[PDB]
Amino acid sequence: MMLGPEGGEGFVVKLRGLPWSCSVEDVQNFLSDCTIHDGAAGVHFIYTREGRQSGEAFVELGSEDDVKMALKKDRESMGHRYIEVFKSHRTEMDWVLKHSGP
RNA sequence: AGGGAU
């Protein structure tokens, strides 16, 4: 937009939730109205040398319509655990996909 | 390590 508030600048979103670990098939199942830019070729995650995920991840998408639809469930659940989503701009995604740590 | 405010 250019006449209202914002929270990002790209067709990318952040992800958080699920057990200490997950897979690209669970995250794409949760954004069941969107596209992951290429699927298992647009997923991302964050972790440390200690041997576990940091608790967060990202999901690239195909268009502005997918990022909007991903935010429509920003705190929903799969049915036995809950999930989180937030808007992004991909610069932050790159900033931690290559600099994550304890 | 844990449900944070993303």
| Domains in chain A, number | 1
- List CB contacts of A90: < 8 A, sequence separation 6 or more: A10, A12, A60
Does the nearest atom of strand B lie within 7 Å of A75's Cβ? yes
Q: Does the CB of A100 sit below 7 A from strand B?
A: no
Domain interval for residue A58: 1-100
The coordinates were experimentally obtained by: NMR
What's the rounded Cα separation, in Å, for the pair A90 and A71?
A: 16
Euclidean distance between CA atoms A8 and A86, whole angstroms: 9
Residue A16 (CA) to nucleotide B4 (C1'), in angstroms, measures: 10
CATH of the domain at A82: 3.30.70.330
Sign of the torsion formed by the C-alpha atoms of A37, A80, A96 and A40: negative
Q: Gap from A47 CA to B1 C1', in Å?
A: 14
Return positions of chain B under 7 A from a protein CB.
1-6
Length of chain A: 102
- Which H helix or E strand runs over A12? strand A12-17
